[PDB]
Amino acid sequence: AELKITQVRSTIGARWKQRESLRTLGLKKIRQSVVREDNAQTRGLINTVHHLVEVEEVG
Amino acid sequence: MLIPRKVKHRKQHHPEQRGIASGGTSVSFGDYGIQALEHAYITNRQIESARIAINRHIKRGGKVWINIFPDRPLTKKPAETRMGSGKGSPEWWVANVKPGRVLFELSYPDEKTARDALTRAIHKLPIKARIVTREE
Amino acid sequence: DVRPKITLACEVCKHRNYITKKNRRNDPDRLEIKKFCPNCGTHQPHKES
Amino acid sequence: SSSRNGRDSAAQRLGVKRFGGQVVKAGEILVRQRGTHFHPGVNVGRGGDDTLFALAPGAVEFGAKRGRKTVNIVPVARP
Amino acid sequence: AHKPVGQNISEVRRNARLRRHARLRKKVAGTAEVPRLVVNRSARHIHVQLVNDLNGTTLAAASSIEADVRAIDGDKKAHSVRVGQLIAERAKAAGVETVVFDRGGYTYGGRIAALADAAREAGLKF
RNA sequence: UGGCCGAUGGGCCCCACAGGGUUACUGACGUCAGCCAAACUCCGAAUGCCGGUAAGUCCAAGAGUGCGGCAGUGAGACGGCG
RNA sequence: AGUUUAACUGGGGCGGUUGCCUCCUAAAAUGUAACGGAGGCGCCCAAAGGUUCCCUCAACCUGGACGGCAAUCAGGUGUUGAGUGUAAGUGCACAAGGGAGCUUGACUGCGAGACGGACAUGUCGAGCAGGGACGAAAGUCGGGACUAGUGAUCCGGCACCUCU
RNA sequence: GUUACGGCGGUCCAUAGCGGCAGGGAAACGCCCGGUCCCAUCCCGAACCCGGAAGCUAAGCCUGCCAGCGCCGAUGAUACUACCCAUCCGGGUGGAAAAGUAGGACACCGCCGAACAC
Numbered sequence: 001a002e003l004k005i006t007q008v009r010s011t012i013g014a015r016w017k018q019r020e021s022l023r024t025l026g027l028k029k030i031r032q033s034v035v036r037e038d039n040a041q042t043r044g045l046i047n048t049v050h051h052l053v054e055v056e057e058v059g
Numbered sequence: 060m061l062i063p064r065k066v067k068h069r070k071q072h073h074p075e076q077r078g079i080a081s082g083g084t085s086v087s088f089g090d091y092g093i094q095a096l097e098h099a100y101i102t103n104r105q106i107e108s109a110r111i112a113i114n115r116h117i118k119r120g121g122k123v124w125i126n127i128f129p130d131r132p133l134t135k136k137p138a139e140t141r142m143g144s145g146k147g148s149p150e151w152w153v154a155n156v157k158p159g160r161v162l163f164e165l166s167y168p169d170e171k172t173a174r175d176a177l178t179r180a181i182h183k184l185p186i187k188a189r190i191v192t193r194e195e
Numbered sequence: 196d197v198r199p200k201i202t203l204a205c206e207v208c209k210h211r212n213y214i215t216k217k218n219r220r221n222d223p224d225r226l227e228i229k230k231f232c233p234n235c236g237t238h239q240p241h242k243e244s
Numbered sequence: 245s246s247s248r249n250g251r252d253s254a255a256q257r258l259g260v261k262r263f264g265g266q267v268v269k270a271g272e273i274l275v276r277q278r279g280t281h282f283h284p285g286v287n288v289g290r291g292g293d294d295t296l297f298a299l300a301p302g303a304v305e306f307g308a309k310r311g312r313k314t315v316n317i318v319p320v321a322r323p
Numbered sequence: 324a325h326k327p328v329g330q331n332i333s334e335v336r337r338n339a340r341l342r343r344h345a346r347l348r349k350k351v352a353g354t355a356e357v358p359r360l361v362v363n364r365s366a367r368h369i370h371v372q373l374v375n376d377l378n379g380t381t382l383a384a385a386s387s388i389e390a391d392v393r394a395i396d397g398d399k400k401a402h403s404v405r406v407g408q409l410i411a412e413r414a415k416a417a418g419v420e421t422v423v424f425d426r427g428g429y430t431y432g433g434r435i436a437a438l439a440d441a442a443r444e445a446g447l448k449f
Numbered sequence: 450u451g452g453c454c455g456a457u458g459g460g461c462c463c464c465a466c467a468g469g470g471u472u473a474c475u476g477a478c479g480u481c482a483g484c485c486a487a488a489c490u491c492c493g494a495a496u497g498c499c500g501g502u503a504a505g506u507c508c509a510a511g512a513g514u515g516c517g518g519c520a521g522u523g524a525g526a527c528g529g530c531g
Numbered sequence: 532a533g534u535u536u537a538a539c540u541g542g543g544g545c546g547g548u549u550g551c552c553u554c555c556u557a558a559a560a561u562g563u564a565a566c567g568g569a570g571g572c573g574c575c576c577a578a579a580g581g582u583u584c585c586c587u588c589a590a591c592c593u594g595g596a597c598g599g600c601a602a603u604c605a606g607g608u609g610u611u612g613a614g615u616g617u618a619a620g621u622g623c624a625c626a627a628g629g630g631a632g633c634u635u636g637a638c639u640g641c642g643a644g645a646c647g648g649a650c651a652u653g654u655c656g657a658g659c660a661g662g663g664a665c666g667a668a669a670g671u672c673g674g675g676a677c678u679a680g681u682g683a684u685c686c687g688g689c690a691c692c693u694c695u
Numbered sequence: 696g697u698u699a700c701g702g703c704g705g706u707c708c709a710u711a712g713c714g715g716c717a718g719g720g721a722a723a724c725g726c727c728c729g730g731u732c733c734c735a736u737c738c739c740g741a742a743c744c745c746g747g748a749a750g751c752u753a754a755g756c757c758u759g760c761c762a763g764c765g766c767c768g769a770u771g772a773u774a775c776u777a778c779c780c781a782u783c784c785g786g787g788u789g790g791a792a793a794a795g796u797a798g799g800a801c802a803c804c805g806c807c808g809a810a811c812a813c
């Protein structure tokens with residue numbers, strides 16, 4: 001499987017741990033499209049940063 | 060003029076009032092009672108005044124209760140002293156109250172007179188309140 | 196002085212090896228103890244001074 | 245008006261210092277408890293000041309037995 | 324009609340026996356190579372077990388109950404000496420030589436001392 | 450805070466060494482129930498932290514730790530949270 | 532004549548404090564201020580140390596008389612509600628609580644590794660060599676149940692040495 | 696193999712404790728009989744220790760039964776809270792208590808050693 005992740009809100013003024021998790025995801029600038037594996041761990045990542053990202057599911 | 064007659068220490072920190080009043084949330088003892096609405100302080104003077112208002116009108120029949128008791132002290136630094144230099148001295152005692160608490164409890168024959176007395180008690184109280192009966 | 200200051204010496208040695216404090220008011224008799232001091236290499240009672 | 249309070253102590257920084265399942269080496273301290281909040285177990289030493297440590301490499305393991313708290317070290321298998 | 328208004332001597336006695344054995348048991352860390360030798364004495368018999376606390380399982384034991392040892396008309400010093408010799412030789416057969424002794428809650432002296440000695444000069448070094 | 454037997458206020462109208470607050474008191478204990486506590490906890494989390502494993506950003510953050518040259522700063526403010 | 536005459540401070544001054552220890556504030560790792568809330572320390576100890584052994588209360592009903600509400604008691608529910616050198620917290624009945632016997636480990640030189648420290652320091656610690664202590668032995672013994680009872684450097688005094 | 700037996704043991708040590716009731720002496724267990732010799736009473740053979748088994752299981756122990764009390768404990772809800780929010784004002788997802796409630800419940804199990812049977 002695969003996931004399309006795109007940050008929809010800026011990182012500014014967000015909890016430091018959330019910012020670091022965003023870096024882990026690998027989104028530098030707002031509205032970047034990134035493809036990632038559908039693991040439980042990345043699912044948890046998206047769940048945590050859900051208020052900043054939208055998920056489009058591919059495959 | 061209710062006051063604890065001895066405690067471990069004569070002063071206490073500021074309060075947290077957040078939270079719904081759980082203790083005594085339902086009338087039990089008599090057959091009628093008040094129930095407050097909003098968080099607030101209640102001074103010993105206020106409690107005593109309400110007790111007088113209830114009692115003197117009810118006169119002979121029935122007997123009252125007071126589910127609360129002002130315990131926590133308070134202080135206010137006298138005027139003309141730049142703030143600092145330690146805690147002030149205690150002035151009055153207050154009993155906390157949370158939404159839904161029952162303040163007074165009555166067992167008198169007639170609902171009308173019970174309501175009337177408790178209404179005067181409400182008017183003399185500092186925070187909103189309303190009648191409530193024993194029923195489920 | 197509430198708690199005087201006492202030294203202890205070996206016999207063959209005579210070396211101020213151990214020092215300890217006492218209440219002279221309640222102990223007017225001199226202190227005796229069996230202990231060790233290194234150089235003569237074996238235990239031996241130490242005296243007061 | 246004057247205050248008679250306002251003095252305090254130092255901060256000894258007590259508390260458990262190697263947590264359950266960690267890997268500790270010989271002579272390693274485990275806890276610093278004023279009272280006997282815990283109790284020694286096999287391969288644990290009772291310090292001069294109610295402190296707990298380990299007398300052999302291994303992984304620390306807490307556990308309740310007889311309704312108390314006692315620390316112990318399981319020697320991790322030699323690779 | 325019986326109404327208890329106090330405590331009981333024998334009950335507190337058994338509790339105290341367990342208590343006092345507890346001090347030593349606390350320390351004892353006796354493995355297969357160094358099992359703990361437990362001694363129990365009755366008003367009529369003596370019992371001894373050699374166990375490794377690691378598994379809480381015994382290795383060898385004997386007591387005044389066995390018919391051959393009861394065949395000894397003597398008293399409990401002699402009974403204890405014979406039983407201790409049996410423990411020693413059974414432990415030797417099983418292949419254990421160095422062990423630790425448990426005071427079994429009783430104070431040393433008399434029958435316990437006789438058992439200890441018998442075990443000592445029977446070849447059981449502990 | 451309000452109730453219950455309450456002998457015995459652990460005690461009183463005559464003190465008999467013996468009947469009643471024959472008298473409204475006190476009534477201890479305990480028990481029925483209803484609150485309160487930063488220095489009370491027979492209870493007890495989401496969080497935070499430390500330890501182990503695994504995936505990911507791995508044309509590098511420009512990630513960490515140590516050592517070495519360099520100065521600043523040790524007058525904070527506000528807002529949200531306790 | 533050359534100089535000294537503190538800081539903290541909700542402006543200064545007068546008051547009070549200046550180090551150390553306990554708890555709370557402290558947001559369940561540590562830590563975390565205030566002239567915030569509350570209390571103590573500048574010791575004691577040849578035993579109140581070590582070890583071996585014995586044993587465990589207080590609460591409880593009754594009183595040959597003093598003697599009583601309480602002095603000592605035993606019968607026979609008895610689980611710390613009593614206590615544990617000096618405050619509080621943490622612990623403590625498997626005792627850290629008493630008694631006794633003995634006796635000095637309140638040893639000597641080191642110290643695997645750690646804890647805390649901005650730094651100087653401060654804390655814990657299994658094992659190794661001599662000797663000793665208690666216990667037949669197993670083992671425990673490097674000060675007190677722990678956490679306060681403290682002072683750097685210089686200058687000087689005193690003893691021993693296979694230093695010059 | 697059974698046992699209405701004794702020691703040692705276990706266990707996020709009370710579902711395992713306490714209370715009342717009934718029953719056990721073949722062996723073992725207790726109580727028990729007496730203190731020359733061991734040993735002890737800060738006096739006492741009360742404790743311990745020692746010699747013996749005349750007696751009895753009342754006490755204690757054990758087992759069985761009782762829900763009187765302790766005790767464990769749902770689902771559900773409520774309190775609480777991580778993160779985010781909308782011009783305060785409380786909701787969205789995640790986490791999910793305490794107490795109370797139906798209920799459960801008068802321990803289970805390991806190794807050896809004793810009486811009946813093989």
Ligand SMILES: [Mg+2]
Pocket residue numbers: 073074075076
């Ligand atoms: Mg508040």
Ligand SMILES: [Mg+2]
Pocket residue numbers: 075
């Ligand atoms: Mg608060």
Ligand SMILES: [Mg+2]
Pocket residue numbers: 181182183184185186187
């Ligand atoms: Mg009002």
Ligand SMILES: [Mg+2]
Pocket residue numbers: 212213
């Ligand atoms: Mg010296």
Ligand SMILES: [Mg+2]
Pocket residue numbers: 253254255
């Ligand atoms: Mg502190």
Ligand SMILES: [Mg+2]
Pocket residue numbers: 083483
């Ligand atoms: Mg209630």
Ligand SMILES: [Mg+2]
Pocket residue numbers: none
């Ligand atoms: Mg609290």
Ligand SMILES: [Mg+2]
Pocket residue numbers: none
């Ligand atoms: Mg606590």
Ligand SMILES: [Mg+2]
Pocket residue numbers: 497
């Ligand atoms: Mg925290």
Ligand SMILES: [Mg+2]
Pocket residue numbers: 500501
């Ligand atoms: Mg980890």
Ligand SMILES: [Mg+2]
Pocket residue numbers: 509510511
């Ligand atoms: Mg780069």
Ligand SMILES: [Mg+2]
Pocket residue numbers: 517518
């Ligand atoms: Mg550099």
Ligand SMILES: [Mg+2]
Pocket residue numbers: 519520
């Ligand atoms: Mg520079």
Ligand SMILES: [Mg+2]
Pocket residue numbers: 523
């Ligand atoms: Mg500065």
Ligand SMILES: [Mg+2]
Pocket residue numbers: 523
């Ligand atoms: Mg500054």
Ligand SMILES: [Mg+2]
Pocket residue numbers: none
């Ligand atoms: Mg500043």
